[PDB]
Amino acid sequence: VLRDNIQGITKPAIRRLARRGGVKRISGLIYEETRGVLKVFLENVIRDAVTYTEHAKRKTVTAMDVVYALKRQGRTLYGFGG
Amino acid sequence: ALIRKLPFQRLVREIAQDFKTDLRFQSAAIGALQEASEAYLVALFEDTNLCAIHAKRVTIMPKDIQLARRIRGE
């Protein structure tokens, strides 16, 4: 088995995502920072996903298991009453 | 997708098996996670950008990313 697959998320992939968010320039420090955040997010969601899976006496996490887990992060909007 | 799927699959497999090794995923489950991950990172960078701008800076820093996490109510 292979480890540190967070390193598999490449620099140009990170720049790609940043540009889509309107960020044109990123320094070398941003890469490992982004990887850290991504791993945390994935960990948190997969935890919640498994909870819905084990509750249904299953061993295979499904797409709907993920969706239910996603419905718990809470909805972030820009501005009030949206 | 903005990220190659095979490297993302390996990342998901690692994190999932580090939780419980006795665990499998549907391909659409990984897809759901990737779409959510990519959307989450894009939104994060948007607020990261806004942070640096309010700081009267032109280049984002590691601190802008961390502050962007806090402001999105994580």
């Binding site: - | 999932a16 391909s27 779409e35």
Partner: peptide
């Protein structure tokens, strides 16, 4: 709806980690 249909495509199903049964 089109993204939902294509959501599962593109991954290595040879992986034992993936169960599409």
């Amino acid at each position: 709806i089109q993204d939902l249909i294509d959501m599962g495509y593109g991954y290595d199903e040879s992986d034992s980690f993936i169960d599409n049964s």
